[PDB]
Ligand binder design. Structure first.
Ligand code: HEM
Ligand code: HEM
Ligand code: HEM
Lengths: 723, 307, 721, 83, 84
């Protein structure tokens, strides 16, 4: 009786006996990608193949289908310890999420220094190009809780753990070069204001609400980073296509004791690319896991995220030579003033096996420095140093979270600390220094032997709570940012402010934010005002504007599209096809796309296979319904008489093309497929619409169009199109 | 100048002179909607108007803008207990989300019986129509974490807490009359299958993934509620517009000691209605808080949920 | 300059150019087992290693906070300081809600011969297997800083790390418990714990709320009798018995069920302190039992116990004058004998008390195939409790990944996450699955998959105490009637001292009234001690009858029913400078011939000089090691030594006290002068006097075999000491 | 230390620990939150007119006395302690 | 396992039945392993034959004659569909 057998112990095989690919644990899909940290983690992995299902005490379970009851139809007995152990564990699976950056995704990889930096720092992981330093990286949004969507408008967090031989180094950054506030003491205020509001917990993953803008309008130090997140920087196409920043000034100390001021950068090898807002929002609807899935699959496809580590290097004596404080984390250092020296490369090449064990439980902290690096007097950074260890006391269950496998260093770590919850190490020597009973081991290490020492910076002043006057400059860099943008980029900025303010209920908040904008730029202020129905007063357009910064009015590096590259490799293309499609054209489109590292995905009216007009079967990647255009970078439709006519009776298929058009994407049409474009209320083909009959030649010109990322010149006409 | 003032202690008013309506706490918008439970809660409420900002120890704070430093450009001092108290509390704001039904929304109200049910049960809250029994209800989805969107295809939870004179009675049901599994020992298995998959934590808020349907395919007892959630019952239009069910048979015992088998239902006064799948998917994009917002605004507008 | 260096980093050796207690890996590395080998991966060796932060960063200056100048303000950027203090601030985890005070050790278990006839349990199948164990001994009432030698039940928890699962035998040192139904456990414990207003008293049941509860709950009297007896004050964890208390089931390969009760019988005998001595010992060595066990393992006097079983065929369950499912009943060994089936040896101390003893987690629900539960309603409630408590005590549901708690067999399942998850899983987290061909898989019962014995269940859902449980006095009476007269007196002593500290007189009268239903002599003696007049109706309360024709059971008496072992006992040798050196040698060599440890206590530490001029290493001062810490006292000759001791009030009092505690005292030669000068009656059977040292010590050892001079007890009450 | 001993950052709401004066601020949430807040949870705010508000020192708002600070960042025992 | 699913299916209006069909097809179309989709469709042939066919159509699954002849459950205490 086969229906009965389902509710009885399962002692027999379940897979189909034959025993494209589903995402998998990194051990299964890329076991050849290795490093020392991953090897350390191997001792905690399991291979259940052939193993009995057991209790946590190692007792074999005979019947995982039924509680122990007084009969087959009786009451459940308290003596069912198997039941209670299983349900107990389940009941306590969840731990608190991070207080900020709750939504995040991680990957393993390695870092290599290009050549010794010994002139600037004694930091071990920067001294030897032959070494492969293991890293773990967690990318994240900021505001949303752990289940919130990926492609929201938000700052992205970027945390890199370097497992070095002289200690674990945490570089804990964001994807914009500045932060919203100058002093750590404002952080809970700013976070509370951006977070969902406390009465109703609305809205999720969105700064487009009253309390956030209220805080903004009253704290103009925030305006610079607000400019960044209102720009397309706030909606990145990929964690692989975004820049990274330590933000704060740090010190590096070399072996002679000389001190250089530094700032950390990540520069993506795959370029800097963003979504556009309408597309990002729709993408939260149909793939809330987009960024996370994309990072996971790029590593399985060998499109490994690569990034170069950069340093702006300021000798100690040039500290006060700028038109801002380099200790101010709302200020960036213009790359035209101080160039970013590329000093190394990091590659993420292996996904986790278990997201919770690795990504959920990893703990970064800016406090986690190494000899050769030191802190500056950045008042935001200083308060950060306390929070990361503190928060982890409850997030990860006590002071022994460094013993969780992903958090373990790969060098030794002997000390006199003991106990705490879930103590894993067993210590049998003296727990106090100095001791003689164990000859004072472990022993302090002199500085020349690599013991950590603080650089003896001078300290002069009075104990006080007061903002440094070198910090009162809230507008010069918001202007520098704005003047550095192309016009398309400035329009998206204006669009960000306008859409967000349009969800602000209290009018006076909207009025006061627009007022702030009149101190950054008058066109920006005026354009946002119009979208909001605010008449600016004559005096407001007379508001004084900040001057230049060390001779700079703009900086090309501040603009995404004028200042950084677009890379074709890794992009996604939807191939729209139904039964009766030209098999040859699909072959030649797919091959041309992959010749450039572009992934073609066939979307059809059903999954499984479609049969070509030649009568051959083509595997389908998914339905058009299930994979709308916001999920791909471009769209191509091959020929086939019966395929094109099927698609013309498909509102999804037609909307695909209208939507891709409105989102400024490349569209390729082969042969009769152009009759499908003609039937839509889309204008004459522009430079991002490619038509031909030879499928290989068409695919080639298409790929060449996709190099522009988006068809910006199309932005104006797409505003009228109804989709 | 007044740019300097924003980074100095703020002693002056900030609201504009003048002094269509935003969502607000229930105490500000419906202070006349009362019950005993709400009255019990009044003593834990605050009235900050006119009050000084203080530490948790009651100490007045003069400067909420700056850490204590060695000079205005100096290093932050460990002796700033104000900073460290403020940051400590923030660092530990979070608590674990519910392991299932993490995403949810709640409201206060009251329950009355129509006429004594003494023929079937001695339960106090089912004896006297004159009693205004306070309730608190939490609606929820099932699979998604606390930040996941409202209009997903999922079962909806429906938990009602009756604060009765003889005890708190919880009716912890769903919006469909059956469940997926028969024996509680399978719940972790079923939950694990439907949840985001363990290697990558994908997908959020959706049963549209291999492990869920692997379980279904191998456990046909699940087919009935699967039928329910693939219907439009799985994408309700509002929590005010869905049915509720205790699902389990209970027992009511009257004063003679006669037992009846009983099943609990909620029938919405505003009817039973659902989105259509494409509109429900689009709503997760443009208002992930739709059901939460709708319930809150409906109460603020006097379109009180009634069941 | 050298004072300056003590507050500067310490980069140089501090070690200088009988032995102390040390971690087990230092002292007995050759004693090993499979579980200790598993623990090695978690052990550390900081020799030659730099002091480092938890992230692996070497520390240069462990003496100073980072400040704004040598005299300045401490800076928030000092992460070394803040990480160090932070770990320190969170060292403590909750203590166990009961049995907070305890001590642990590793060892192994061996079955003598396969028990396949009665059970399929793997660790009882193969006499050649050495099954590792970890054992925690404990008191019950006190918190973790409370004293070892209080009057209390002793807990006895053994974790057997078997190849088919971890099995926990969580028992006590008496064969019954105080209550019948688990629901009463928090009531009983609240009553015995310190009272909730003032948190007084620590480690004592001698207060109002305990005796109040006893007086209203006669089911408690049986175990009260045990703890009021000298069983409540064991000499040593090595010298008590052990019991699982509950009736368990044992299932063999045919599916035949035997009812089972577990026992540990100590190889070193069963011996106890006396009350006055025990109480003094909580004063001068609150770690007596922990230290003694630690040191007995380091000495080689390894704790050894034989596992016993009383075996009852299923069809005999209803053939007794008591319910075998009642945890306040014991099964008299005269009716159902204890078959010794295996042996436990404790042979290795832990390395880190907190990592191993504090964090170990036991639960009676941790059974293995071949064993099953009974319907004992105490035991059924216990099954829920142990796992639940450990959720907060050890911080979540992954406590089984703490190394002391890990099985040594595989443990694959579909559980995931939870706080401080160590394991990294990569396969399907649900059963049934096909994506991993459903591994790990359920195991058929014939393959070792656990199954529950299909006991019949017939009844009505109800809250009711089984009528067969309502017998409260017959076993207390049997236990009373089985004691020697000295043991009965100490029982009377126990009740009278404890009730003496009860403030509300009606509680004392109500307890005495309960006693009149057990034995009238017992009640009368306690009543007299408390100034209580017993009515004639009370003197005439009806007494229970024999249990299955039984009115005594010799095994219920420590001293008449069990053996006293001379080996491993401790003897104080009182000596100062000028002691006869050959006497000491001769005493030592004799003590050693019988396995007894001689400890030289002198007026100062270091070495003393003998009258022959040789130096003798001292074990401690007289003042630091009073007579309550040793089993017997011997005083060697030597004119200058004796004269020194007679000028020493402590040394004189050492002899008076040991006398009053009924201990053997040996006196050589002029040493008798010291005894004679004291306000002591003339020598008795336990005052060995002699001139030849070797002879005297041999005779002195022979007197020790008796443990105590019970006949001395009457005159002992008149001794001013 | 009290975060783990007393179960989180709201141990000030345990009765014995409560102050007897007012104590409004913008802290929220945390394990076992007893008090129920209903106003803006950030400062500065305008939606509740910035209440609760900072208090001037002459009104009793805490201030650190401006002691001079002069030295070098360093881990060193003060010579004046060496006795 | 199947009588009550069938009773639910037959109580649905035609629109509601189409939306149920859309649910399975949309969801099962994100399932990567093909044998899982085919087993799910195989369970649906014990509930209703049309339901199985409409969903197997959207998944590119050809039903077999053996499957299209799978026995369907009988009525529930005389009841074949319930308006509620
Ligand atoms: C310079 C501006 C800052 C940047 C770029 C930054 C960056 C980050 C990032 C990337 C994370 C998430 C790391 C991860 O788990 O993957 C994070 C977490 C966090 N940050 Fe910040 N942060 C900044 C400022 C602050 C400030 C001022 C505070 C408050 C003192 C703060 C407190 C926290 C806390 C508590 C967490 C959660 C840590 C955890 O749960 O493990 N951060 N920050
Ligand atoms: C009859 C089917 C079930 C229904 C209708 C149901 C309903 C619910 C609901 C509505 C909630 C959310 C309550 C809230 O708002 O806080 C919930 C939570 C929960 N349920 Fe279920 N449930 C069912 C079955 C199960 C089973 C079998 C288990 C496992 C034994 C389980 C364990 C849980 C747990 C652990 C929570 C979280 C509770 C909390 O954190 O407060 N439920 N259930
Ligand atoms: C026959 C009666 C009982 C005996 C012999 C017994 C024995 C013990 C022993 C020896 C321990 C200490 C284990 C260790 O060293 O870690 C202990 C702990 C404990 N027992 Fe009992 N017990 C009994 C009854 C009960 C009952 C009725 C309950 C409550 C239902 C209970 C609850 C506990 C709890 C909560 C602990 C602490 C467990 C832990 O924290 O690890 N026990 N028991």
């Amino acid at each position: 009786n086969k229906a009965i057998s389902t509710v009885e112990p399962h002692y027999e095989d379940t897979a189909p006996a034959e025993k494209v690919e589903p995402m998998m644990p990194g051990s299964d899909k890329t076991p050849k990608n290795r490093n020392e940290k991953l090897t350390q983690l191997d001792k905690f992995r399991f291979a259940p193949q052939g193993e009995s299902l057991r209790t946590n005490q190692g007792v074999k379970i005979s019947d995982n289908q039924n509680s122990l009851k007084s009969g087959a139809r009786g009451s459940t007995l308290l003596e069912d310890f198997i039941l209670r152990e299983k349900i107990t564990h389940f009941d306590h699976e969840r731990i608190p999420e991070r207080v900020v950056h709750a939504r995040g995704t991680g990957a393993h990889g390695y870092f290599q220094v290009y050549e010794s930096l010994a002139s600037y720092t004694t930091a071990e992981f920067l001294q030897d190009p032959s070494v492969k330093t293991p890293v773990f990286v967690r990318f994240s949004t900021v505001q949303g809780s752990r289940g919130s969507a990926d492609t929201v408008r938000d700052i992205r967090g970027w945390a890199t753990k370097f497992y070095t031989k002289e200690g674990t180094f945490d570089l804990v950054g964001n994807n914009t070069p500045v932060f919203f506030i100058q002093d750590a003491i404002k952080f809970p205020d700013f976070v509370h204001a951006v977070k969902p509001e406390p009465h109703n917990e609305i809205p999720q993953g969105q700064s487009a609400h009253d309390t956030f803008w209220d805080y903004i309008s009253l704290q103009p130090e925030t305006l610079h980073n607000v400019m960044w997140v209102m720009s397309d920087r706030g909606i990145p196409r990929s964690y692989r296509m975004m820049e990274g920043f330590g933000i704060h000034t740090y010190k590096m100390i070399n072996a002679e004791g000389q001190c250089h001021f530094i700032r950390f950068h990540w520069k993506p090898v795959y370029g800097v690319s963003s979504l556009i807002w309408d597309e990002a929002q729709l993408l939260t609807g149909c793939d809330p896991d987009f960024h996370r899935r994309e990072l996971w699959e790029s590593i399985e496809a060998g499109d490994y995220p690569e990034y170069e580590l950069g340093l702006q290097i300021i000798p100690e004596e040039d500290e006060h030579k700028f038109d801002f404080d380099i200790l101010d984390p709302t200020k960036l250092i213009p790359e035209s003033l101080v160039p970013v020296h590329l000093v190394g490369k990091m590659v993420l090449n292996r996904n986790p096996d278990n997201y919770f064990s690795e990504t959920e439980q990893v703990a970064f902290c800016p406090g986690n420095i190494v000899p050769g690096i030191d802190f500056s007097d950045d008042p935001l950074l200083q308060g950060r140093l306390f929070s990361y260890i503190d928060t982890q006391i409850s997030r990860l269950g006590g002071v022994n979270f460094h013993e969780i496998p992903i958090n373990k260093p790969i060098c030794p770590f002997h000390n006199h600390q003991r106990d705490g919850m879930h103590r894993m190490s067993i210590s049998g020597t003296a727990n106090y220094e100095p001791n003689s009973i164990n000859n004072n081991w472990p022993r302090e290490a002199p500085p020349t032997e690599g013991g950590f020492t603080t650089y003896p910076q001078p300290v002069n002043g009075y104990k006080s709570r007061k903002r440094s006057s070198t910090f009162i400059d809230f507008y010069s860099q918001p202007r520098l940012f704005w003047l550095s943008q192309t016009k398309v980029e400035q329009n998206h900025i204006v669009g960000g402010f306008s859409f967000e303010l349009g969800k602000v209920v209290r009018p006076w908040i909207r009025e006061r934010v627009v007022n702030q904008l009149t101190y950054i730029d008058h066109q920006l202020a005026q354009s946002v005002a119009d979208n909001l129905g605010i008449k600016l007063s004559q005096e407001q357009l007379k508001h004084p504007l900040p001057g230049p910064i060390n001779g700079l009015s703009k900086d090309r590096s501040l603009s995404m599209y004028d200042g950084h590259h677009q890379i074709l490799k890794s992009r996604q293309v939807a191939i729209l096809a139904a039964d009766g499609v030209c098999g040859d054209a699909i072959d030649n489109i797919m091959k041309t796309l992959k010749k450039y590292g572009v992934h073609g995905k066939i979307f059809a009216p059903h999954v499984g296979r479609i049969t070509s007009l030649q009568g051959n079967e083509i595997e389908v990647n998914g339905t058009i319904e299930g994979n709308p255009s916001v999920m791909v970078d471009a769209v191509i439709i091959p020929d086939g008489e019966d395929s094109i006519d099927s698609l013309m009776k498909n509102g999804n298929a037609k909307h695909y093309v209208i939507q891709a058009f409105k989102h400024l994407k490349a569209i390729g049409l082969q042969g009769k497929a152009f009759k499908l474009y003609d039937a839509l209320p889309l204008p004459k083909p522009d430079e991002g619409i490619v038509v031909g009959d030879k499928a290989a030649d068409l695919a080639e010109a298409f790929c060449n169009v996709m190099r522009g990322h988006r068809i910006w010149s199309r932005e104006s006409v797409a505003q009228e199109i109804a989709g």
